[PDB]
């Protein structure tokens, strides 16, 4: 033991004594085995100096036969100098020891007997050796530590993996996803004080080779090395090896003030020989090294615990996936590493970054953000070539050395490589080290291997492969290769045969690639250039890959795991965007995006945002200053942030899987204030970047203006840029000098100082302080709140409910666990305080902490799912200890005490379950499934696949998605919450803890004066809610497994997976599929419930009975109601019988079956919670005047007659009709009460009354804040819901209640309805029963016309080969919507004659659009719609402002001087007279001869859409007057077009009613409506893969025949169309069919049709057979035959 080894330690070694004590030999034991080779060496420094003398000596020390060949002669010399450097710092520590022995007579006091070794900063004196008068370190304990410090210096940051997200939020107070760019990347440079010394203290303990004492105070087993590690950290920062930095984000944050210090270690020279082998000392002193690179057969072990979660043990299923990943082998790519080193590190930075950087040509705020951008690349560049240098030393061929990596399980159940820079995280290393390989036959360009080769190249160059067919993708790829990228490819071809690059290589690549610049784009060019120069193209070996990426993986996974209740048609359509197709076998994502829908979930959320903003803006028609504030915010965003779809799509940033999109951030529970800060930070970054362009433009020409140097590329003239500058300055001052505030449901503007003034000064421009705060306040109220409503509309309101309950349960559980852990360490400190041995400054033992942690097991802290384990509250906090661990000898650096204890989870509950169970289980299954794909790199939600296994590995990836979607996150969380309620005691919590749980369990009004019994009642109510959500999810997954599905979530190739369901759901509309799925949902509910327990005509096909008008007249007597109100029904009966009201009633099954047969949408109200109660309600169809009842009684039938009649008066009043004067006052009186209804205080009411009020408000406000529904319909619905609430709560409020404000409201509304029902005649006295407890329970159905913005925005992103797939037109159509379509009035359009002035311009412009296409300019359906819409926008503006087309006249006249007929002829010297005729036809239209005034707007519109005309125009010379701008004629024409529309945008955004332009806009909206519906008809008419009119028609008829009806010869015809002989196809097709015998199967079918041969088949069976043969011949002869002919050429013609 330690008594035997170095027994010359100072002090007494006894456990207890009265004299001085040495606690080192007590807190540390002696392991029996060997861990450090210097345990028995007095002088370890000379033990390694002799070890590193030569290769022969190095072999014997480590006890192995062979060493790493990289230990060559050069690195021996470099280690000798570094070893001497460690000796230089060894003597430095001696000097500080001598100073301590005499300064402040500490040694003299130590000589007296004072226990200074037990102090905060004296723990280092437990090891100091005795020399009598003087004292000194034990030499062995000192030398072994320096080697730990030296090895730490080289690999301090290399081994530091990616920091966890939870830790970053803890040290900042803001979620890492909402942090601005640059600061997040700054973590690689700086590490906090605790992190710097804890890492160094880990090495020191390991190098000593000792064992901790489990029964010793934590202030000695952990504080002794930490105190000495800080000493070694000193004299290292003294040599400037580490720098000191202070954070600024929290410093500049208007609210946060938590300053954080950072520590960054300086790098080393990239050419250092020591960089070729930096792990010589580590692998010599140690026995089993942990810092290693695995070559050949070296396989890493499997970790037994999670990452930074020692309490969680890896499950046996998890350990199988970790083993599989580390078995994959990697090889370097030789061509890339040779290309990288020729460019150099500096040229790489210029290409990838923003060019060369200098303080003169950069904004102050913009320049500092590039430091973190450039820091990552240089570190990654150095790391890659350090690894390669080690590989090259082991073999002559560097491309044949296998390399293995390490993996571990993170806190959310993902797999992450160990190391900061690796192929998983860094993208520079990704293209040099790959595990994929393939062999292809490229001798023919029509092969199938060439098609897969093209897919890899197209995806690398930023082409959306997962949205187009494989034929369309090849068309666009070839254009780039022979077009813009041609100069770059030619340069690359020269490099492959010369090894040299042009001087201006960086400039060439920037012009070629453009905005597609990425490290994978250079890979595509290298492989293509290698292909051209190869001679034998039949055995090409390439590492090119294609990644299978998920389509909105985040939101889609959450939508399938935390959704309950019945199915809805909205859910079916929205889930299709993720790749879940119902009733469509063998369907792929490419087919869906080409014929069904091209809008993803990210775009759908944005569309709903603009509808909510329009509704909010419309409510302030009487408050002009508020409206102008909204327009300023929108105008500023368009100038700098065209699209808000943020993400991890950068170029020089590491990949961590963090979600930074506004849609995903909101769902994960981020705060509203936090979101607004992130959006503001993006806008200001774009402003700062523009300030770095004016500085550069000034250098080239110091005479230009500020407007020219900023908005030059977007200006059509000199004066246009002046308008843009003035608009930008006006908007900026308004936002930063005014703030919106909320005053009882309305917004009021207030002044808070002054904003930015008139001075740019691009070098020193900054927005900060009070101006920054006013920016975020404007965005929070005007942008974030409308954004939340739009998200709830897409993902559904059922998922939002489940997220709130999950967050509340996880927050409450973590707060309790945090309080009891702190309450039990305070007891042990008090118990140990009386112990004489214990002394303040120590802490608990390791065993005591273990028992306290094990004492909370009855509260169920961990969640188990059967394959994964989660510990949300786990963290390495420091607030629990609230002490000081140790400090430096100069009392400068103080290290606090950190323990592994539970911590508050905040709002981390939601992202934990979505990622761990949705994506983690998906990607863990893929590794361990039967037949898993091999040789793939998987990052977090993608998987790189070699080109030889794409079609099969992409199908097993989709299969793993299906298995992942069978989990239940809510059920697993509930199982732990139920046990937590079983062993908790709320009366033993701290006063602050009870306050924290109150904020989650209770509302605002009931928060103050909260009783403990009130906290427990609400806390136990959440447990009931989770039980109902879990039950609903379980039934949903069981039902979905019984139908046929096709899953294409993770795919970019077109290989889906089938679930082999047996119930057919095809040939149905989305509303029909919901009815079928809801039937099975209720069937499963009935079976479980029974398990525990063990007058009118009738329809023929169902038990439903029908009651018509004039059939319930006698029912007045049957009810035997009082005679005073009996006469009322006699009047109600007459009214409803006048408009043909019929009543349908039956059992729930009978009434549901009737709807399916008659195609009726039902609105029955019942839930699983209501199923236990057992009450069903019907619905009313106001469109056709039909009432549907479920199991009616005498009371309910009477209640509905007086309810339907009442709603008719409400509908008529709000439709602009006239009503009785008595009814008009009653509705008006009710309307006024509703205004005060939503402003009451319910804090003094009964708990059961609060729930009723809460439900009413949520549904009422939804109708009022709805923008896509007709306001007349929405207004009536809101009032109808108000009456139902009052009648429902009359009984329970009239008794056992006080006279509260809400109670009086119930009594008033009841009387208000009484006057409305009875009219002007006398009503029954107050307090009398209405109709034996009258109630309103049936729902209403209402429909109306959709708005213009609804249909125009639907077809914006349509694209297809038969429809048109021009990308430039879609982007042009997007900017049109922002300027024109968004500002149209929300009311639905009408049809009036509209005689006026602008209406003449639109009629004239419509005729010219058609006339242009009939006189030489053919257009597709996509080009036609954009041509019509844009021209009508310029036509109405020119009819209001006569000088709008002044600039376009100058450009039109200049073009006419350099135009000739020969410009329109492909062959200038053709002989066919028809070729010249068509060219002359196009010339006349441009000259205006054919068109024969609104002629100018048509030309301006045509010059933007047509692609053939723009090619001719761009080659014309530029006038000398416009040479200053520096733009071609085509861009000058497109910039003039937006100027006209921008002027019109201001016209519609002002006071339309007073300007007398309201009628003119109503004419423009009609034209947009007409053109939107026309492109909705051409689309869906080509909705087939072939895009043919006939093919689509045949498919519709076939599916309509299978609905009513409720093989061999197909192979022979395939052989006829696949003949490759040449001598056989020359004999005709009659001979082949006669020789092919195919005439016999045809005879059998026709013989049945004619009747010669008898058969038992019906008509529908034979019709399905004849129509199946026709489609077979069309498929083979029109599609497959042309491919055979084209396959005989070795080229693409």
Residue numbers in the entry: 1008 to 2101, 2124 to 2521, 2529 to 2642, 2664 to 2750
What does the paper say about this structure?
N4-like phages have a genome size of about 75 kb, nearly twice that of T7, and encode around 70–90 ORFs, including a characteristic large virion-associated RNA polymerase (vRNAP) unique to this family of bacterial viruses. The massive 3,500-residue vRNAP 18,19, present in 4 ± 1 copies inside the mature virion 20, is ejected into the host upon infection. In stark contrast to the N4 transcriptional program, which has been studied extensively 17, many key questions about the role of phage N4 vRNAP as an ejection protein and its part in the DNA ejectosome remain unanswered. vRNAP (gp50) consists of three predicted domains: a likely membrane-spanning N-terminal domain (NTD), a single-subunit RNA polymerase (RNAP) domain, and a large C-terminal domain of unknown function (CTD). In this study, we use a complementary top-down and bottom-up approach by determining the cryo-EM structures of both the full-length recombinantly expressed vRNAP and the fully asymmetric N4 virion tail.
Single particle analysis (SPA) of cryomicrographs revealed a heterogeneous mix of particles with two predominant and two minor populations. 1007–2101) and a tightly bound complex of RNAP and CTD with an unresolved NTD, referred to as ΔNv-RNAP tight complex (res. N4 isolated RNAP and ΔN-vRNAP tight complex were real-space refined to a model to map correlation coefficients of CC = 0.90 and 0.84, respectively. The tight complex of the RNAP and CTD forms a compact structure where the CTD binds the RNAP on the opposing face of the DNA hairpin promoter binding site 24, leaving the region open for promoter binding. Despite a large binding interface of 1,659 Å2, PISA analysis of the C2 and RNAP interface indicates a weak interaction with a ΔG of nearly zero at −0.2. Interestingly, interactions are slightly stronger at a ΔG of Ȓ2.1 for RNAP to C1 with a 725 Å2 interface. A salt bridge between D2012 (RNAP) and R2279 (C1) likely serves as a clasp for stabilizing the tight complex, which is not predicted to be stable in solution. The CTD buries a large surface area of the RNAP occupied by the fingers and palm including the palm insertion and extended foot domains, but despite the extensive interface, the overall structure of the N4 RNAP domain is relatively unchanged in complex with the CTD (RMSD 3.7 Å), barring a few changes in subdomains unique to N4 and a subtle shift of the fingers. Cryo-EM reconstructions of the four high-resolution states provide clear evidence that the CTD drives the B-motif loop into the active site in a conformation that we predict is inactive. Although the CTD makes sparse contacts with RNAP, it allosterically regulates three crucial motifs of the RNAP core: the intercalating beta-hairpin, the B-motif loop, and the N4 plug module, thereby repressing transcriptional activity.
